[PDB]
Coordinates of C-alpha atoms and ligand atoms in Angstrom, one line a residue:
Chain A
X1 CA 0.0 0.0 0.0
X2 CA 1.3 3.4 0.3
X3 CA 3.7 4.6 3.0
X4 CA 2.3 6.4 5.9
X5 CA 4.1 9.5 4.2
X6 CA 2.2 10.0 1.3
X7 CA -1.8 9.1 2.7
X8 CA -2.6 12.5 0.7
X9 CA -1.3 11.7 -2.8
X10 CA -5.0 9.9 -3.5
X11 CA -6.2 13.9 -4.3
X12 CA -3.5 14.7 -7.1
X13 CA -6.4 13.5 -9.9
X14 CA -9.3 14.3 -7.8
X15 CA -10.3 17.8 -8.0
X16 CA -13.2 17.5 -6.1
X17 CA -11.7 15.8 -3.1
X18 CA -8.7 18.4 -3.2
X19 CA -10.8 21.2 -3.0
X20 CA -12.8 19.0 0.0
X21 CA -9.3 18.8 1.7
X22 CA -8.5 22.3 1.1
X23 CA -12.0 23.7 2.6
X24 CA -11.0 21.5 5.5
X25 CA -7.5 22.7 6.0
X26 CA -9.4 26.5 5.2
X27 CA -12.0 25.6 8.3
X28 CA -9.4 24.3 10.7
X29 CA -7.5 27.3 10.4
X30 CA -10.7 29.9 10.8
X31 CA -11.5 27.9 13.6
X32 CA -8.1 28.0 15.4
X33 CA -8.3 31.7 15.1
X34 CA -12.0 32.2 16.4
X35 CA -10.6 29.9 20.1
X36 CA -7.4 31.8 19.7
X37 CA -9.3 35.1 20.0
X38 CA -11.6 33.7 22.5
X39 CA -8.8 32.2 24.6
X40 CA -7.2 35.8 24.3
X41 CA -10.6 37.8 24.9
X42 CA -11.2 35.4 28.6
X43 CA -7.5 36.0 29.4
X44 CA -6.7 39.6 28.4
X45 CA -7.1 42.2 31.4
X46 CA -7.7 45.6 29.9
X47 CA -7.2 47.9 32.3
X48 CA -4.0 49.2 31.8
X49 CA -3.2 50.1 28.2
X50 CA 0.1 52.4 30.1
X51 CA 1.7 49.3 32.0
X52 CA -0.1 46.0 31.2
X53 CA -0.7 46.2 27.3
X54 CA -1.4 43.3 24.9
X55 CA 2.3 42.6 24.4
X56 CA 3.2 42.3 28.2
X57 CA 0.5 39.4 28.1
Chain B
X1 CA -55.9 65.6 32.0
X2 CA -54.7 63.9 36.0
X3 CA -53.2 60.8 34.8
X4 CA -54.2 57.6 36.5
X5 CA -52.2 54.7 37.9
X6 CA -53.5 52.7 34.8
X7 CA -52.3 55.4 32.4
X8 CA -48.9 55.3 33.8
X9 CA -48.6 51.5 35.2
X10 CA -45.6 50.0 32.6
X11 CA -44.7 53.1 31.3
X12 CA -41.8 53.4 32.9
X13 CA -43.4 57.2 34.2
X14 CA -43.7 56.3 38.1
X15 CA -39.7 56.6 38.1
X16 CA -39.6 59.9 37.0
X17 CA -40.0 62.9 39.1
X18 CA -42.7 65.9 38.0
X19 CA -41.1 68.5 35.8
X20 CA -42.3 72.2 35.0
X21 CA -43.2 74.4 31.9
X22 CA -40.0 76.6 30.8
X23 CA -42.4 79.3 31.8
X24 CA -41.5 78.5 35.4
X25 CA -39.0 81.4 36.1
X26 CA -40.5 82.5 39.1
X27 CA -39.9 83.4 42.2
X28 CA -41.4 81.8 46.0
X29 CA -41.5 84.3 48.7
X30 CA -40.1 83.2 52.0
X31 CA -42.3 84.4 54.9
X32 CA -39.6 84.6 57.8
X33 CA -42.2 84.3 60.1
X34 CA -43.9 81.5 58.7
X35 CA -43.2 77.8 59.2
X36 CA -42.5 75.6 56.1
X37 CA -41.8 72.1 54.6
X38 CA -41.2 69.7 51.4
X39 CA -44.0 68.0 50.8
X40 CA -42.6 66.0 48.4
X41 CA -39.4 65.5 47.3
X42 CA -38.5 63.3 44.6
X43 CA -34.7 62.6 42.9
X44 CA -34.6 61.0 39.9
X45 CA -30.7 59.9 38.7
X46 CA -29.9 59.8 34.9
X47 CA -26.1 59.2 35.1
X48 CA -24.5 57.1 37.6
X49 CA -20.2 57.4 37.2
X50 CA -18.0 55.2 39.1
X51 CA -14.8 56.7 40.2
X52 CA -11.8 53.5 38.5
X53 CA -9.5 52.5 40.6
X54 CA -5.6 53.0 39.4
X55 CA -2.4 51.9 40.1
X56 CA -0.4 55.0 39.7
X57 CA -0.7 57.1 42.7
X58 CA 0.7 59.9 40.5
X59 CA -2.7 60.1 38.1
X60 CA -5.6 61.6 38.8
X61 CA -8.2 59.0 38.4
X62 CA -11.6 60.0 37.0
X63 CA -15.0 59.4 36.7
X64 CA -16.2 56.9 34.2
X65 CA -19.6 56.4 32.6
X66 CA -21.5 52.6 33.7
X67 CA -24.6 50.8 32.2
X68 CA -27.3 50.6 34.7
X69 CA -28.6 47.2 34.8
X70 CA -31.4 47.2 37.8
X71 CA -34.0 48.5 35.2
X72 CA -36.1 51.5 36.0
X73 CA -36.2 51.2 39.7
X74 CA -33.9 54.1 40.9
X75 CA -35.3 57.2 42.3
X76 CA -36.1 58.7 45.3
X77 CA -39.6 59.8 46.3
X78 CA -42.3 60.9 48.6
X79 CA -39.8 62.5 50.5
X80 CA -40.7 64.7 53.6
X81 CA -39.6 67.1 56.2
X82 CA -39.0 70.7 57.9
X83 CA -37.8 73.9 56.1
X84 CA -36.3 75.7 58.4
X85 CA -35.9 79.7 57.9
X86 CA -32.4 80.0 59.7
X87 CA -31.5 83.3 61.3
X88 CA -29.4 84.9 58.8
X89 CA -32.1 83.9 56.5
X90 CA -31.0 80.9 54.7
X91 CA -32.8 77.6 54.1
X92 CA -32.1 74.5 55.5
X93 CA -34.1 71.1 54.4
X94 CA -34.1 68.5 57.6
X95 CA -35.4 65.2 55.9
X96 CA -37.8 63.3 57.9
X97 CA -38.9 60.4 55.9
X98 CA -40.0 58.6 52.8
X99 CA -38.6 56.5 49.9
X100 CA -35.5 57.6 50.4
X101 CA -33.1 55.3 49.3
X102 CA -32.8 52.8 46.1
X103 CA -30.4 49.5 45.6
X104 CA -28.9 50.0 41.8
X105 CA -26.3 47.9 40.5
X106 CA -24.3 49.5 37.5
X107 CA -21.8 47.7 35.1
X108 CA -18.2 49.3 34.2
X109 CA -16.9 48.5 31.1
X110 CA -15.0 45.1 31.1
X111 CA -18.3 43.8 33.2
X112 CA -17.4 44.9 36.5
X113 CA -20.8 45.4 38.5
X114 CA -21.1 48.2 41.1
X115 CA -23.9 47.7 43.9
X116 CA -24.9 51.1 45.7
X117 CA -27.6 52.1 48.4
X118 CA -28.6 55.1 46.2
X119 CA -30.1 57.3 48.9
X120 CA -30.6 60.7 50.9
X121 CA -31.2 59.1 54.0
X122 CA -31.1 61.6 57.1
Ligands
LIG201 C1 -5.9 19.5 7.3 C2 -5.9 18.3 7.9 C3 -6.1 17.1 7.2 C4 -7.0 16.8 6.0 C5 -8.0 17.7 5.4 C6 -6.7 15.3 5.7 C7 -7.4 14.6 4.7 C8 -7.4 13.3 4.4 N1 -6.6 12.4 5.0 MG1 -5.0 12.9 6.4 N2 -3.8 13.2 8.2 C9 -3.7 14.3 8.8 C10 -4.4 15.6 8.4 C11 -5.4 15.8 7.4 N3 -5.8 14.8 6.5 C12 -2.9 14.3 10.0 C13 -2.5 15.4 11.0 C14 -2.4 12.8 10.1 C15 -1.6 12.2 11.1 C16 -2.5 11.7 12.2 C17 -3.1 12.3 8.9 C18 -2.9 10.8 8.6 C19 -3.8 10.2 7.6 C20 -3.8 8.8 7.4 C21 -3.1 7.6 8.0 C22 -4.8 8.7 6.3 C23 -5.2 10.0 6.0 C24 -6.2 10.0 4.9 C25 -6.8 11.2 4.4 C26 -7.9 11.3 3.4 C27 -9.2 10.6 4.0 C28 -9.6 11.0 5.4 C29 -8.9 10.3 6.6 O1 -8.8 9.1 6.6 O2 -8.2 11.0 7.6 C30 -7.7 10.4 8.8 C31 -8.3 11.1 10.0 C32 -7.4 11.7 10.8 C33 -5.9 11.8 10.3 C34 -7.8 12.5 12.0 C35 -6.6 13.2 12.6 C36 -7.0 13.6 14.1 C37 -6.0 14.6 14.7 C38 -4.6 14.0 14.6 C39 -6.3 14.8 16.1 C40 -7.7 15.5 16.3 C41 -8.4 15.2 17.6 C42 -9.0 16.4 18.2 C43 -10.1 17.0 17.3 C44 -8.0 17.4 18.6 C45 -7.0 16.8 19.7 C46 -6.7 17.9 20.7 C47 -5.9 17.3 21.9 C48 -5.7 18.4 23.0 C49 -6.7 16.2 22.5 C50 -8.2 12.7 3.3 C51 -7.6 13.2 2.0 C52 -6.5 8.6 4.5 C53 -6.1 8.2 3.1 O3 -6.8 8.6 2.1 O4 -4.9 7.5 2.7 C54 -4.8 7.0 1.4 C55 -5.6 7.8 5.4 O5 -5.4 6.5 5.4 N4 -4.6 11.0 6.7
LIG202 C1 1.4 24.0 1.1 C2 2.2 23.2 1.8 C3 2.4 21.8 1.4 C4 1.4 20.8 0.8 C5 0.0 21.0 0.4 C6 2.2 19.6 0.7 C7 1.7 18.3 0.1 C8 2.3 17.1 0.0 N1 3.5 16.7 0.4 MG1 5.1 18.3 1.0 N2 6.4 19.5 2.2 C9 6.0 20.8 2.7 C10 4.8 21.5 2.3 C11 3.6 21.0 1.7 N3 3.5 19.7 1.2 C12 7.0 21.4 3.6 C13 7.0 22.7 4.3 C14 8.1 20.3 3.7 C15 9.3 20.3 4.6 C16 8.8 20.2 6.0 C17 7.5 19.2 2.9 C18 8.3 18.0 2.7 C19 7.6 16.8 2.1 C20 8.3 15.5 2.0 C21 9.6 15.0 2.5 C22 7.2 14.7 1.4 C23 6.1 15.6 1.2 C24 5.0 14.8 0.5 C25 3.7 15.5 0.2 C26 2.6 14.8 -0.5 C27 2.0 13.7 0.5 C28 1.8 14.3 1.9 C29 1.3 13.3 2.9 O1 0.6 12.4 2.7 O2 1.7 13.5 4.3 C30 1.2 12.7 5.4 C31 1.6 13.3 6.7 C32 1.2 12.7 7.8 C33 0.4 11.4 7.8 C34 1.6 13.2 9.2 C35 2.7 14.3 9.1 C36 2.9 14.8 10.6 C37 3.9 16.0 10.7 C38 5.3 15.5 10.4 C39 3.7 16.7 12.0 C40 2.4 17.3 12.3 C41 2.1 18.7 11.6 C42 0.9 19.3 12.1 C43 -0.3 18.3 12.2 C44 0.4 20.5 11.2 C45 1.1 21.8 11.5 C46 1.4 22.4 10.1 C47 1.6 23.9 10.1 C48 2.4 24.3 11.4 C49 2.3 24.3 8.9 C50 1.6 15.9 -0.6 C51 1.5 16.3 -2.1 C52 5.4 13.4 0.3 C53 5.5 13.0 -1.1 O3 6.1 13.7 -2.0 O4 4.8 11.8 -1.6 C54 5.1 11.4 -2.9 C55 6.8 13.4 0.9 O5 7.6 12.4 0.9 N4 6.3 16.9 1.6
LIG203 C1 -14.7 33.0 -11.4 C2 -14.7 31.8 -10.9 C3 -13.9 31.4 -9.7 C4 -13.9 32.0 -8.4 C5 -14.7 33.1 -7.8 C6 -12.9 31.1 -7.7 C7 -12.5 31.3 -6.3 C8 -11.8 30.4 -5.5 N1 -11.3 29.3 -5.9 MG1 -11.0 28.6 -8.0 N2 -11.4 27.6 -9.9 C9 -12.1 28.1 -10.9 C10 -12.7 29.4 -10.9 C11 -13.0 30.3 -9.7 N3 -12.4 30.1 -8.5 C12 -12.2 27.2 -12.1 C13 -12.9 27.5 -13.4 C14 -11.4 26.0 -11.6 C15 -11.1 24.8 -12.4 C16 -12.2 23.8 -12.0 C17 -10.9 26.4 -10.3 C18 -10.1 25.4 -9.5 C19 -9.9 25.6 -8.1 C20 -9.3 24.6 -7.2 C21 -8.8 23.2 -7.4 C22 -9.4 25.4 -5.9 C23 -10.0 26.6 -6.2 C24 -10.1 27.4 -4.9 C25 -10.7 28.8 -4.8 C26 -10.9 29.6 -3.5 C27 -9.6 29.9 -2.9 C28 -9.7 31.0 -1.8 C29 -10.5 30.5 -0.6 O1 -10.9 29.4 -0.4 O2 -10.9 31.6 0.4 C30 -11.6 31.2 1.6 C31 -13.1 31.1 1.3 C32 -13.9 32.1 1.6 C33 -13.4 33.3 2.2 C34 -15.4 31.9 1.3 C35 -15.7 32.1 -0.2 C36 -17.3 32.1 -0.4 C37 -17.6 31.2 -1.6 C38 -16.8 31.5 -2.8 C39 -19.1 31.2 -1.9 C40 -19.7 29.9 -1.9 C41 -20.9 29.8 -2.8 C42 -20.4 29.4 -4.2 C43 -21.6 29.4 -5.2 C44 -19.8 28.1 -4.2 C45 -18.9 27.8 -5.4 C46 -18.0 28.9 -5.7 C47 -17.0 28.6 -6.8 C48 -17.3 29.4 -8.1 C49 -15.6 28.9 -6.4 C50 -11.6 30.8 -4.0 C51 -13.0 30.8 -3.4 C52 -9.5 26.6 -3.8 C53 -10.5 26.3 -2.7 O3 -11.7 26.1 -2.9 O4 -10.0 26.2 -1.4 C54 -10.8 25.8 -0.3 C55 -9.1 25.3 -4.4 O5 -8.5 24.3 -3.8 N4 -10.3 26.9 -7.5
LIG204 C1 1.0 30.0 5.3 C2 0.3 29.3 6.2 C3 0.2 27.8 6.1 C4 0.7 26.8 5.1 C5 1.5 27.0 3.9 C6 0.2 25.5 5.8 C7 0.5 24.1 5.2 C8 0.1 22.9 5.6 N1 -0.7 22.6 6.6 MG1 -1.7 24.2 7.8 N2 -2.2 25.6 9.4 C9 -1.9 26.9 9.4 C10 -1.1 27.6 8.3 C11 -0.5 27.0 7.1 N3 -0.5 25.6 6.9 C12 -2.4 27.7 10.5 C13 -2.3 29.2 10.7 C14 -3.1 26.7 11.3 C15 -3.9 26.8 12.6 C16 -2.9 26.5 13.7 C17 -2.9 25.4 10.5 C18 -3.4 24.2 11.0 C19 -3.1 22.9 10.3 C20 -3.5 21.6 10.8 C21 -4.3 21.1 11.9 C22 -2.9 20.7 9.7 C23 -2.3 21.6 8.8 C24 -1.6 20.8 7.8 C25 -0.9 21.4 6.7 C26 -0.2 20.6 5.6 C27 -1.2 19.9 4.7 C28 -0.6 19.3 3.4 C29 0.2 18.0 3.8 O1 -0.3 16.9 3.6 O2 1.5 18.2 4.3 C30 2.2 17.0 4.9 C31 2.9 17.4 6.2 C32 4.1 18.0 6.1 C33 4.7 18.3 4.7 C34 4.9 18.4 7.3 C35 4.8 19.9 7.6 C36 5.8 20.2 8.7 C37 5.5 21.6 9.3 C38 5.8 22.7 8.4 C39 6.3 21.7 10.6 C40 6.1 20.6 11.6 C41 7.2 20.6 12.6 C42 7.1 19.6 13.7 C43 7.3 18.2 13.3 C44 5.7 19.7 14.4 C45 5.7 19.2 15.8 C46 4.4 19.6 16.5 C47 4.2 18.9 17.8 C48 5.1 19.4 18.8 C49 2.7 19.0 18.2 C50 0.5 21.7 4.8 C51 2.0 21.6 5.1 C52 -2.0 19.3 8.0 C53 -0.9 18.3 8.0 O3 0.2 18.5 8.2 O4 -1.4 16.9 7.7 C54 -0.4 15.9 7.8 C55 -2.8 19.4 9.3 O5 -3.2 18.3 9.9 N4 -2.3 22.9 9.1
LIG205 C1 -20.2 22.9 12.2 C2 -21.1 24.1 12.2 C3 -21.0 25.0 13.1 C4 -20.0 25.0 14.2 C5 -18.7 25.2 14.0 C6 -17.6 25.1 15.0 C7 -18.0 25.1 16.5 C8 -16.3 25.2 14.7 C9 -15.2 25.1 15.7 C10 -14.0 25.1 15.2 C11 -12.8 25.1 16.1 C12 -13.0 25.3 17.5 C13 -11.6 24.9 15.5 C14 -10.2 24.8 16.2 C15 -9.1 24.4 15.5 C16 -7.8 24.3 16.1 C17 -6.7 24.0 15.5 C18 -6.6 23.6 14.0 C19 -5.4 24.0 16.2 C20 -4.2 23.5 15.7 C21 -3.0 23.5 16.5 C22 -1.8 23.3 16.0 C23 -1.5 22.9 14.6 C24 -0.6 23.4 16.9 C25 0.6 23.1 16.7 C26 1.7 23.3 17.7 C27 1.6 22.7 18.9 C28 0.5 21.8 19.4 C29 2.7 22.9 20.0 C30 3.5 24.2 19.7 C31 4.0 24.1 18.2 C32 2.9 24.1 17.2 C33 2.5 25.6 17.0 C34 3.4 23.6 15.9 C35 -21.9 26.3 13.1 C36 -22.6 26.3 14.5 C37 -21.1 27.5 12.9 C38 -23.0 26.2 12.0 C39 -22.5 25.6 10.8 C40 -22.2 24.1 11.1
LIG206 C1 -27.0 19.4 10.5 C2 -27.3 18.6 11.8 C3 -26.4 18.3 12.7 C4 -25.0 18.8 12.4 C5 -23.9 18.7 13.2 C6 -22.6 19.3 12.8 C7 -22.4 19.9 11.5 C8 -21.6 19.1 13.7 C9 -20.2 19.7 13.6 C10 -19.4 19.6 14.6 C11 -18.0 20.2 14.6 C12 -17.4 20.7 13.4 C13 -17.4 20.2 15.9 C14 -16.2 20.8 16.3 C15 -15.2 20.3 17.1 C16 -14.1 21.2 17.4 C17 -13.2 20.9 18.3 C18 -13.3 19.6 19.1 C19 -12.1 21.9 18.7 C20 -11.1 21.7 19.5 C21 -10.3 22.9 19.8 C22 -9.4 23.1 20.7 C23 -9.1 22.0 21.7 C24 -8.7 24.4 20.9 C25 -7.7 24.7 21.7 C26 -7.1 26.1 21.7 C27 -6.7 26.7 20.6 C28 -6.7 26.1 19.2 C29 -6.1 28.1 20.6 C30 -6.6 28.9 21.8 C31 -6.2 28.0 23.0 C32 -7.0 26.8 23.1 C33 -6.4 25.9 24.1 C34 -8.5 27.1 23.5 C35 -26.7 17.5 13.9 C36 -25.9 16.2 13.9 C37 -26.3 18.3 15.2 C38 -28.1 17.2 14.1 C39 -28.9 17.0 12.8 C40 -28.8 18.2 11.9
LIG207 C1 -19.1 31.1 20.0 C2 -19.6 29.9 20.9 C3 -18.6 29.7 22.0 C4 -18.4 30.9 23.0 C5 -17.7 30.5 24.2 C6 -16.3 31.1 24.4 C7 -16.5 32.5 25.1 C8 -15.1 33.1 25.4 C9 -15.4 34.5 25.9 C10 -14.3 35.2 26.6 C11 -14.8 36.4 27.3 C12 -15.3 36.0 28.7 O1 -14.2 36.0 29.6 C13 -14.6 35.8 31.0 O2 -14.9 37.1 31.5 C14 -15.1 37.2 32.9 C15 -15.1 38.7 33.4 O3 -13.8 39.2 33.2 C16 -14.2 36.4 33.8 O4 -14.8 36.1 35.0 C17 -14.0 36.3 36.1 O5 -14.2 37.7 36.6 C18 -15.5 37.9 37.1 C19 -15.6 39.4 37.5 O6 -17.0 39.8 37.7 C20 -15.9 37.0 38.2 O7 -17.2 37.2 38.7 C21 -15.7 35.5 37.8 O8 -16.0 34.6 38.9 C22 -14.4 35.3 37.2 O9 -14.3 34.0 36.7 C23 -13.8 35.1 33.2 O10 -12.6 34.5 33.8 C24 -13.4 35.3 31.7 O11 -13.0 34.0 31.1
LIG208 C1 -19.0 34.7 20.2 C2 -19.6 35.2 21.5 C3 -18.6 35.2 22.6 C4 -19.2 35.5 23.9 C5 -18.9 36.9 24.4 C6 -18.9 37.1 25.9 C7 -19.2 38.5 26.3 S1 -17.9 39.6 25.9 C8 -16.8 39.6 27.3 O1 -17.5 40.2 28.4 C9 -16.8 40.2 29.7 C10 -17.7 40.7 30.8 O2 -18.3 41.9 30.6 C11 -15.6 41.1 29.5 O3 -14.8 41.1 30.7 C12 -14.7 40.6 28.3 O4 -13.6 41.5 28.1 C13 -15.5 40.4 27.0 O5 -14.7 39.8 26.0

């Protein structure tokens, strides 16, 4: 069969499923940055842009 | 044209206190000889600002704007008491009784909520 290292070879003729694999790739990375800005929005403390800004945290 | 408590029940008008035409630029004699009091006194708050708290000594910290979230259930009302005419002929209001106080939570910005006993008491 093939090696573990090329699984994703099957979608070189297979438009359809490419596209399927790159709408997946597209929605985990929209997802990762909706929970990163969530994990950022219940962790970021905004009351000191002077002293505490976003970078110190 | 008296309004009744069905006109105003829901309205949201039993927390606001009475106002008067902009022809009301008069003027109410004091009688130094005559006794006097408030019938009714009623204090209705429009802007409640909640002084922050900082971490520099060195600034001045100020007054901030809050989101009242205790609906309309704030004023003071039916208030009461003596007017006295003092000797050198000022006023002096000596409250005796009535709703005088109101619980009213407010929300800073960032969520913080800020209980207060809203009130004129004595
Ligand atoms: C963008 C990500 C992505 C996409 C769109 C695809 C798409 C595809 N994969 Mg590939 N794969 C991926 C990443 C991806 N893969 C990763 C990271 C691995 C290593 C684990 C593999 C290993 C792999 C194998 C062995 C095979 C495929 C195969 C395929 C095809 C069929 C679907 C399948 O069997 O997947 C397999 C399902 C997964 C790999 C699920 C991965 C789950 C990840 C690792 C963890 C997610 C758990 C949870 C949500 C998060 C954990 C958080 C933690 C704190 C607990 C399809 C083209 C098949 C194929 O067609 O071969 C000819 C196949 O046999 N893939
Ligand atoms: C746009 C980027 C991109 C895309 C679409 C591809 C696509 C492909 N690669 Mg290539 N490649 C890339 C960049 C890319 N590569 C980079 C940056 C490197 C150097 C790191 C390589 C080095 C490379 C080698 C040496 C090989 C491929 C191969 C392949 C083919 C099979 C892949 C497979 O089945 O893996 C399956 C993978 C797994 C089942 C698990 C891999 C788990 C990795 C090691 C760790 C987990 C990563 C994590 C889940 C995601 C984080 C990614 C993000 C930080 C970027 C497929 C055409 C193979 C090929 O040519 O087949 C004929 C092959 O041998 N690629
Ligand atoms: C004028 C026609 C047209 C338009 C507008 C596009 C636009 C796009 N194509 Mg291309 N493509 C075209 C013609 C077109 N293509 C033709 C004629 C071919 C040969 C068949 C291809 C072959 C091709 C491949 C193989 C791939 C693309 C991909 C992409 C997308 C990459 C960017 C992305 O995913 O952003 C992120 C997405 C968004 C921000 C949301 C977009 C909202 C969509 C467009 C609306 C959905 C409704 C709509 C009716 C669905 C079909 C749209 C379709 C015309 C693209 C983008 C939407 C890639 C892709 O789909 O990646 C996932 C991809 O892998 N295209
Ligand atoms: C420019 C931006 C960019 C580009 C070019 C890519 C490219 C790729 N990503 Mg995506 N990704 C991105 C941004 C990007 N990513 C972002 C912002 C996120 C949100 C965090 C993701 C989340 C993501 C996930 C969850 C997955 C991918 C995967 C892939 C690979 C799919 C094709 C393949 O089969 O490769 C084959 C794999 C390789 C060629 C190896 C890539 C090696 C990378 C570059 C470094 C890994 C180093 C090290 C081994 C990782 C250890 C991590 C461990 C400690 C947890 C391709 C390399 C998928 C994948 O790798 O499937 C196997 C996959 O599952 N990406
Ligand atoms: C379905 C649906 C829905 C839902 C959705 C959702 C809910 C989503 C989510 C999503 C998500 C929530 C996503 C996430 C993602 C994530 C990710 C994708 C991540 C990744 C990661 C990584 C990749 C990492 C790596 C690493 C490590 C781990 C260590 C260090 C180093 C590095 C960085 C490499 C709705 C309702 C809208 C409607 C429609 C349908
Ligand atoms: C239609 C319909 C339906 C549908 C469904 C669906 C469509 C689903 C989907 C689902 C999904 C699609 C889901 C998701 C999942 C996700 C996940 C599981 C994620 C994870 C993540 C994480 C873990 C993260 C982490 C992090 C990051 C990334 C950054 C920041 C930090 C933190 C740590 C937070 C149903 C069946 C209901 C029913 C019938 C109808
Ligand atoms: C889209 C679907 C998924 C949505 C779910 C993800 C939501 C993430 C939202 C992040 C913003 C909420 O962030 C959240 O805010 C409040 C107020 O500061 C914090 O709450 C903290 O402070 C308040 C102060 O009143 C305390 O009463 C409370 O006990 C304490 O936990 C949480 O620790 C923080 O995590
Ligand atoms: C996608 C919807 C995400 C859910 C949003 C949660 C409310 S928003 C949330 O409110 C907290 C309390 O006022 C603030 O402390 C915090 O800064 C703010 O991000």
């Amino acid at each position: 069969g093939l090696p573990w290292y090329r699984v994703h070879t099957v979608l070189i003729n297979d438009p359809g499923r490419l596209i399927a694999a790159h709408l997946m790739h597209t929605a985990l990375v929209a997802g990762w940055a909706g929970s990163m800005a969530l994990y950022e929005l219940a962790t970021f403390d905004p009351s000191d842009p002077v002293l505490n800004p976003m970078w110190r945290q | 044209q008296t309004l009744t408590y069905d006109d105003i029940v829901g309205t949201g008008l039993a927390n606001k206190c009475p106002t008067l035409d902009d022809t009301a630029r008069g003027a109410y004699p004091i009688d130094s000889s005559q006794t006097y009091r408030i019938a009714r006194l009623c204090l209705q708050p429009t802007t409640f600002l909640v002084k922050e708290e900082p971490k520099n000594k060195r600034q001045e910290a100020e007054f901030v704007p809050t989101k009242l979230v205790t609906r309309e259930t704030t004023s003071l009302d039916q208030i009461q008491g003596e007017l006295k005419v003092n000797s050198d002929g000022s006023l002096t209001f000596v409250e005796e009784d009535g709703i005088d106080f109101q619980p009213v939570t407010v929300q800073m910005a960032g969520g913080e909520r800020i209980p207060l006993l809203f009130t004129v008491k004595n």
